[PDB]
Amino acid sequence: NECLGTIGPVTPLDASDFALDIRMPGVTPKESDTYFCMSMRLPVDEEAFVIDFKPRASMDTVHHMLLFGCNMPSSTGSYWFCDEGTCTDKANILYAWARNAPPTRLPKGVGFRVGGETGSKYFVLQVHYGDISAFRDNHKDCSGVSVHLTRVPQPLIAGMYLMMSVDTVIPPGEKVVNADISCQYKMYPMHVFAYRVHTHHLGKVVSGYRVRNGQWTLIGRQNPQLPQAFYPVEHPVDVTFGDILAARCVFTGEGRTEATHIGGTSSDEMCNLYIMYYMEAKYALSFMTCTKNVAPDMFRTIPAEANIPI
Ligand SMILES: [Cu+2]
Ligand SMILES: [Cu+2]
Ligand code: NI
């Protein structure tokens, strides 16, 4: 979508609301599959709430876009290759836009808390230029996301529960390697409303579940090779103190002449399940993470769908 020019990136929507456009600074990808990053300091220092997102993506070149909240972008520059890093501190994903899998809106009354003393001070945008054909014109690109921010406190707060493997090793040619992740939930109840799966080329299926008294409730199941957008859940699933979140990524080593471990490059793998949730404002925490596997055995009871592709 058009570069903003003279009007700037901030549009007053009303006294309490305003839209902030986060766009690439007129960039021109010179190689296919370029990952460019840029940051935007929040205009206000006080706490605000992000209540909507509107993509401004060029349907041709842009493969996917991710918007994160953090306090220390990886670079002080205008833009930079994301392979340099997104955020020095923890990058809290807030939005993902995938080319052929349109994003779902946040439920109304739900917002991510930013700014203030504890929320993100910056937004970091990542734009993945896949096919850079339409860039021979050597035209500058300003794709991005328009965020709707409000100072009006939201009754439900959005957060992210990230389950990620750190130790997986996929022997070469190995037909099937599983990456199990599990943790006991120890906070106030959260309600999952969307999920996103992330894996590199060896990923076949990624599934996540709430396990309560031994029964498995599907949160989300997706083939990570399909566009990695946040997909809505079939039905809202509350996760409560006492429950255990379980996730499994099914990989294959076929095609690889060497072992593949967890890592950031395409020759490495990742097993990430982003579980987007909402919590009552007074009980809400913005992010939780599980990088462990506390109930290995429990996986003997994982639904068969978790192993069969989709
Ligand atoms: Cu992409
Ligand atoms: Cu990755
Ligand atoms: Ni409920």
Swiss-Prot record:
Protein known as: Peptidylglycine alpha-amidating monooxygenase
Effect of H128A: Impaired Cu(2+)-binding
Function recorded in the entry: Bifunctional enzyme that catalyzes amidation of the C-terminus of proteins. Alpha-amidation is present at the C-terminus of many endocrine hormones and neuropeptides and is required for their activity. C-terminal amidation also takes place in response to protein fragmentation triggered by oxidative stress, promoting degradation of amidated protein fragments by the proteasome. Alpha-amidation involves two sequential reactions, both of which are catalyzed by separate catalytic domains of the enzyme.
Residues at which Cu(2+) 1 binds: H63, H64, H128
Resulting phenotype, H200A: Abolished peptidylglycine alpha-hydroxylating monooxygenase activity
Binding-site list for Cu(2+) 2: H198, H200, M270
Outcome recorded upon mutating Q228 to E/A: Induces a fully open peptidylglycine monooxygenase structure with Cu(2+) distances of 14 Angstroms
Gene: Pam
Residue ranges the record marks as coiled coil: none
Record organism: Rattus norvegicus (Rat)
Cellular location(s): Cytoplasmic vesicle, Secretory vesicle membrane
Source taxon at top rank: Eukaryota
Disulfide bond entries: C3-C142, C37-C82, C70-C87, C183-C290, C249-C271
Peptidylglycine alpha-hydroxylating monooxygenase: region residues: 1-310
Family: In the C-terminal section; belongs to the peptidyl-alpha-hydroxyglycine alpha-amidating lyase family. In the N-terminal section; belongs to the copper type II ascorbate-dependent monooxygenase family.
